[PDB]
Amino acid sequence: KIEEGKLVIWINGDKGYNGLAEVGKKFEKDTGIKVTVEHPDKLEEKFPQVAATGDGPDIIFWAHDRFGGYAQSGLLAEITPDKAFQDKLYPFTWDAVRYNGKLIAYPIAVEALSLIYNKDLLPNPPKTWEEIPALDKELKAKGKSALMFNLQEPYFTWPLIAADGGYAFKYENGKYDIKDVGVDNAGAKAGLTFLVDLIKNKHMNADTDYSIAEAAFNKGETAMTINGPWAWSNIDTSKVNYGVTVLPTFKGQPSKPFVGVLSAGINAASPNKELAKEFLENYLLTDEGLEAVNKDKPLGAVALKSYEEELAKDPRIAATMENAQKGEIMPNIPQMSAFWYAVRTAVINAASGRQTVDEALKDAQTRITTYDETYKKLIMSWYYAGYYTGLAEGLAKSEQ
Amino acid sequence: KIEEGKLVIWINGDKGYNGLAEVGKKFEKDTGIKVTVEHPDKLEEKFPQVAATGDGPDIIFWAHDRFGGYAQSGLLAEITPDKAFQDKLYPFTWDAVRYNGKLIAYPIAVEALSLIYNKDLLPNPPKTWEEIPALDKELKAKGKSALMFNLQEPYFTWPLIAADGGYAFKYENGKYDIKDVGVDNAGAKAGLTFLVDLIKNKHMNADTDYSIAEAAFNKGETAMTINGPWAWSNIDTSKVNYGVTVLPTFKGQPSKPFVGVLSAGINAASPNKELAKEFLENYLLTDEGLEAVNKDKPLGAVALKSYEEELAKDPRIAATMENAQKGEIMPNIPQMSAFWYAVRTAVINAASGRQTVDEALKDAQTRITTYDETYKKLIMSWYYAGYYTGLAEGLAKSEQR
Ligand SMILES: OC[C@H]1O[C@H](O[C@H]2[C@H](O)[C@@H](O)[C@@H](O)O[C@@H]2CO)[C@H](O)[C@@H](O)[C@@H]1O
Ligand SMILES: OC[C@H]1O[C@H](O[C@H]2[C@H](O)[C@@H](O)[C@@H](O)O[C@@H]2CO)[C@H](O)[C@@H](O)[C@@H]1O
């Protein structure tokens, strides 16, 4: 039983959860309804687990790519904004949260990765990926490095895999073809090979995660990182003098970040759907609501036109859109979950040297094209049996 | 590296692989066939991945519990010892390697864990798990600890989980029921809760593994360990003065270790099956072949009657068979691999506090009862996607720290 008469919200711990809680305090002040904001680890995996049993938050925030899966599983209420409200957000953001003809979440922000660089170490950022190895050689001679970014999560490596031709599912005639997958074509291989060579030549290390890359950039140890607007707040605190710019090209072609619309879905099992709609439409999705969240951790570009026109005066937000426009909106289909788990494993195995690039991407292509949602529960249960065993083994020397 | 006219053998690196290579040298001296003994890591996971392609070893040594899965997948040759040869080994050993009516490996040794204890630190060993926290409190004040053993491998914790009523698959009769799994009943929970409490109360550390427990016992730092007979020769080298005895009781009931029959299977893709039969029947399964292996690392109780009658005189082998009698022979059915992968994750997550005992054993029970051997390749493809992802994540987090 989710409890009637209050709202519980889950949102990722990289986002402005404290600013969201301030909107929640204002909602309580006007309405009497208490709002509790939590940021559980792995909430995008935890949500469908607790919500399947009718528990969990009233409202879940995540990028839109997970929501078609959640909707398919019956976890998300259809939302009911009137046309006047829908006119306040850009049309392409509503398209990202439309699944089988129904709106299933409220769009909040438009997220894309950018290249973030330290202006003191590197006054003119490289326009190409190909120039990064020579730059790293130069910087290593000064005890610095050229680039560090999260290698554990395929969101960050995808822009390079997609630049020369990689794609998730082929889009044609307004539909994604779940059986036409582009993770193992010549462009995907060229980009992942380029990444793997950076690692073979010691310009990057496979054991790099978000926290490692964030610390190296914010301590002035590495000249560049790849990250979204939520990261800007810790950089601002570090006082590194940084710029936010277009991602390097690869083979003369733009990097193509997958663009996520951070969105708020309402749990199908919540008895508080009308209060959740009120909080989202009349408190959060206002200039003052989004500003409260943004002042905590930047949202980047936002779906609300009136506030996006103010935010876009900042060239960091314009650069975020410049990168977004060069990439592709994520599909929200339920097969996105298999896509990301398969690509995450492929990047990991090629980066560690466990598999060659061609072996890794061939295995990911089969895993995705032969995936069948009928077996989702079985497949996920055994993935996690493997994940907790491998995590304990990876953490071991670290205890003993 | 399987080539016609030589033999490649895989055996685990804790066993007497150097001793086995001396048997291989004798075979090469008599027959001119070269024998190469290797001990790859994770060989029991590697074999089912590579045997069906260009393999793989000619002969694989492992406890019998993995071999039903290999045989069901077509990976092992039917072996053809005549009746006179079979009569030289104990019948219950041939039952452990019989799968759907066919013999699929040669039994070698009967393995059961025992309590190993340092007589200088504990002259009389405990017969209860319940006393171990009190013995640890006294030993901590002497700069030592009571018990250390490998907590990463569920083989070592299973005797305690099974003591009060945990079981893998209900036997009846004489069929294992794959739908009737006993990892999440009150007895399984009571055993695993006792282990988790030992860790919560700082009598053991969740991260202790084989080499940490072995170094502690053999350097005289901890009074007890739980291990099999292959461990005894490193202790002999240490001159800790040790004994080998019955595992402690829990709620007055015996610990029930799962008994493995270390067995030698012949790869179905071997073009040397006649040579492997000659090596195994005429060189290894003789007093002189088993003695050579045992002199390197003890096999424990052996399946070959002539040699076991001589070994049974050693009180360490009597303790091994006493523990084996109180425990159960593992099933060899294909679903045993699914059992161990699920219980490995459950013990690891409960020990480290990532899940409660109830949640950990509930997930193992679901994983085991929903596994379907027909879908093993789909299931294992995703298990390994998870394993490599979690390994990479943990290694990155170790670098952060
Ligand atoms: O790495 C795969 C992962 O990518 C995206 O998740 C992003 C997310 O969109 C952001 O809002 C942010 O905080 O970082 C996450 C990357 O680690 C997909 O949305 C997600 O489904 C996918 O697993
Ligand atoms: O821990 C589960 C593991 O248990 C048994 O493996 C034992 C094995 O029988 C011994 O010969 C020795 O190698 O130690 C192993 C424990 O680390 C099962 O035989 C095996 O299938 C299972 O995964």
A111: nearest Cα among A151, A43, A62, A149: A62
Residue A219 is classified by DSSP as T
B257: nearest Cα among B122, B65, B89, B108: B65
* Residue ID of nearest Cα to ligand 1 atom 16: A155
Q: What share of chain A is helix, strand, coil (3-state, %, to 5)?
A: 50, 20, 30
Q: Is B6 in a helix, a strand, or coil?
A: coil
Q: Is B33 in a helix, a strand, or coil?
A: coil
Amino acid (one-letter) located at A335 = Q
First CA to last CA distance, chain A: 42
For residue A264, give every residue at least 6 positions away whose Cβ sits within 8 Å of its Cβ, in sequence order, or none: A9, A59, A60, A61, A105, A106, A108, A280, A284
* CA B381 from centre of chain: 24
User: Do you know the residue count of chain B?
Assistant: 401
Residue of chain B whose Cα is closest to the Cα of A154: B389
HSE (CB half, 13 Å, CA atoms) of B109?
28
CATH level 3 topology of A7-110+260-329: D-Maltodextrin-Binding Protein; domain 2 (3.40.190)
A140: nearest Cα among A79, A201, A91, A93: A201
Assess whether the previous peptide bond of B252 is cis (omega < 30° from 0): no
Task: Tell me if the domain spanning A114-256+335-369 has CATH number 3.40.190.10.
Answer: yes
Q: Which residue has the tokens 């036997």?
A: B171
Output the six-digit token pair for B302: 């052996």
Could you give the residue ranges of the DSSP H alpha helices within chain A? 17-31, 43-52, 67-72, 83-86, 91-96, 132-140, 154-163, 186-200, 210-218, 232-238, 273-279, 287-296, 305-311, 315-326, 336-352, 357-369, 376-399
Strand B114-118 relative to strand B242-245: parallel, antiparallel, unpaired? antiparallel
Q: Do domains A7-110+260-329 and A114-256+335-369 have the same CATH topology?
A: yes
Cβ separation B387–A386 shorter than 8 A? yes
A139/A221 Cα distance (integer angstroms): 10
A18/A130 Cα distance (integer angstroms): 40
A371/A368 Cα distance (integer angstroms): 5
- Residues with Cβ within 6 A of ligand 2? B 12, 14, 44, 63, 65-66, 111, 153-155, 260, 262, 340
| Deposited experimental method | X-ray
Is the CB of residue B148 less than 8 Å away from at least one CB of chain A? no
Q: Is A246 in a helix, a strand, or coil?
A: coil
A209 closest CB neighbour out of B342, B366, B396: B396
Q: What are the sequence ranges of the domains in chain A?
A: 7-110+260-329, 114-256+335-369
Q: Which residue has the tokens 């650069």?
A: A319
User: Do you know the residue count of chain A?
Assistant: 400
Is the CB of residue B172 less than 8 Å away from at least one CB of chain A? no
> What are residue A76's phi and psi, to 5 degrees?
-120, 130
Query: Ligand 2 centroid to B63 CA: how many Å?
Result: 7
Please give the CATH number for the structural domain made up of B7-111+260-329: 3.40.190.10
A149/A351 Cα distance (integer angstroms): 13
B274/B66 Cα distance (integer angstroms): 23
Query: In Å, what is the CA distance from A88 to each residue of A82, A84, A164, A252, A304?
Result: 11, 7, 36, 38, 6
A347: nearest Cα among A329, A361, A336, A362: A361
Please give the CATH number for the structural domain made up of B114-256+335-370: 3.40.190.10
- Other C-beta atoms lying within 10 Å of the C-beta of residue B256: 25
Q: Please check whether residue A299 is in contact with residue A109, taking contact to mean a CB–CB distance below 8 angstroms.
A: yes
Is the CB of residue B353 less than 8 Å away from at least one CB of chain A? no
Output the six-digit token pair for A365: 């292509």
Q: Please check whether residue A276 is in contact with residue A58, taking contact to mean a CB–CB distance below 8 angstroms.
A: yes
Is the CB of residue A52 less than 8 Å away from at least one CB of chain B? no
Q: Please check whether residue A339 is in contact with residue A168, taking contact to mean a CB–CB distance below 8 angstroms.
A: yes
B310/B171 Cα distance (integer angstroms): 33
B261/B287 Cα distance (integer angstroms): 18
A146: nearest Cα among A206, A196, A213: A213
* Burial category of A143 from C-beta neighbours within 10 Å (exposed 0-12, middle 13-18, buried 19 and up): exposed
Q: What is the resolution of this structure in A?
A: 1.7
A132/B61 Cα distance (integer angstroms): 49
Phi-psi region of A49 (alpha: psi -120 to 50; beta: other; left: phi over 0): alpha
